[PDB]
Design a protein around this nucleic acid. Structure first.
Ligand SMILES: [Cl-]
Ligand SMILES: [Mg+2]
Ligand SMILES: [Mg+2]
Ligand code: NA
Ligand code: NA
Length: 326
DNA sequence: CGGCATACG
DNA sequence: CGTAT
DNA sequence: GCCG
């Protein structure tokens, strides 16, 4: 079992679902307390289990797996022995965990804002609605739309949204293209937002594109919220039988020279990309981001024409998006 | 022990 | 500070 | 929390 998640296939569904979910609770709780190192370790340990070819049934099967030390091994041991891990259950029922989860799920609220509100004694969404002068406009939109944004987005929703984005993109810049990214490109059947990447085959033609797209969507009455650039974090009005619902949509523009890097980055998963960037820098001495891959010795950028190019230039076996679900 | 991904709004 | 993979 |  390789030590980096980008060195091994990780499918969307797997054979250790309960064990990985428990470790991911501890990762999330670590993040709520600002412990980024422990969050990473628990996420990595969870991801190792997702990559295994069969269920873990005995503690000895963890021997030699990367990212399993005393703490993660004890969690697994308790789940195998008793079906429950007391630490995990203690986190789950705690007022701190439940409130930080509720608050950080709000669009416009991060861990730092949630933690401050918690320390002020706030606990519920209606607590927040009672003092709206404290909220940013983004937080107001996140709170107004919270119920809809909590409802899973389905594949049929994605197909509808892609058509309306393509229509607006086509008037904004003929020849521009729209690619579905994020979790839906990795094969998810449900999600909580939809991610799109926009480019144009002629380098430079994509400059200034996103304002033109957003204005056209807003004039069609489809935008319930946006920040007004190359990234837009929107709330869309999606038609529903007899009504509609609010959906989070992210629109990203990249020049075609950078498209493979942006596609790779925005397809994720989040942990896959962190691990890939860590692998690039620490094992290969190259600096990876959503714009390119830089050789800091020669001071040169690697031209890529495809995701396959990028995996080759990092010495990694290619993984399709469906196997990047770290 | 240091390190833990890297960006944009 | 928030957002994203 | 775990790795090199
Ligand atoms: Cl980036
Ligand atoms: Mg997404
Ligand atoms: Mg997200
Ligand atoms: Na949030
Ligand atoms: Na998104």
């Amino acid at each position: 079992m390789p030590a980096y998640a980008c060195q091994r296939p990780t499918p969307l569904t797997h054979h250790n679902t309960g064990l990985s979910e428990a470790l991911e609770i501890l990762a999330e709780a670590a993040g709520f307390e600002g412990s980024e190192g422990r969050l990473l370790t628990f996420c990595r340990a969870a991801s190792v289990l997702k990559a295994l070819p069969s269920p873990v049934t005995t503690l000895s099967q963890l021997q030699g797996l990367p990212h399993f030390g005393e703490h993660s091994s004890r969690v697994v041991q308790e789940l195998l022995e008793h079906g429950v891990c007391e630490e995990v259950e203690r986190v789950r029922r705690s007022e701190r965990y439940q409130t930080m989860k509720l608050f950080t799920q709000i669009f416009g609220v991060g861990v730092k804002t949630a933690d401050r509100w918690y320390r002020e004694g706030l606990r519920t969404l209606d607590d927040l609605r009672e003092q709206p002068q404290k909220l940013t406009q983004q937080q107001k939109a996140g709170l107004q739309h919270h119920q809809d944004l909590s409802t899973p987005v389905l594949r049929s929703d994605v197909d509808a949204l892609q058509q309306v984005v393509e229509e607006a993109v086509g008037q904004a810049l003929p020849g521009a293209t729209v690619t579905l990214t994020g979790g839906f490109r990795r094969g998810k059947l449900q999600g909580h937002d939809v991610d799109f990447l926009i480019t144009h085959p002629k380098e430079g033609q994509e400059a200034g594109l996103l304002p033109r797209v957003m204005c056209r969507l807003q004039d069609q009455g489809l935008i319930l919220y946006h920040q007004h650039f190359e990234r837009s974090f929107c709330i869309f009005r999606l038609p529903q039988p007899g009504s509609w619902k609010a959906v989070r949509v992210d629109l990203v523009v990249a020049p075609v020279s950078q498209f493979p890097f942006a596609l790779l980055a925005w397809t994720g998963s989040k942990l896959f990309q962190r691990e890939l960037r860590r692998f690039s820098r620490k094992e290969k001495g190259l600096w990876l981001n959503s714009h390119g891959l830089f050789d800091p010795e020669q001071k040169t950028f690697f031209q890529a024409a495809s995701e396959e190019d990028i995996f080759r230039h990092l010495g990694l076996e290619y993984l399709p998006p469906e196997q990047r679900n770290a």
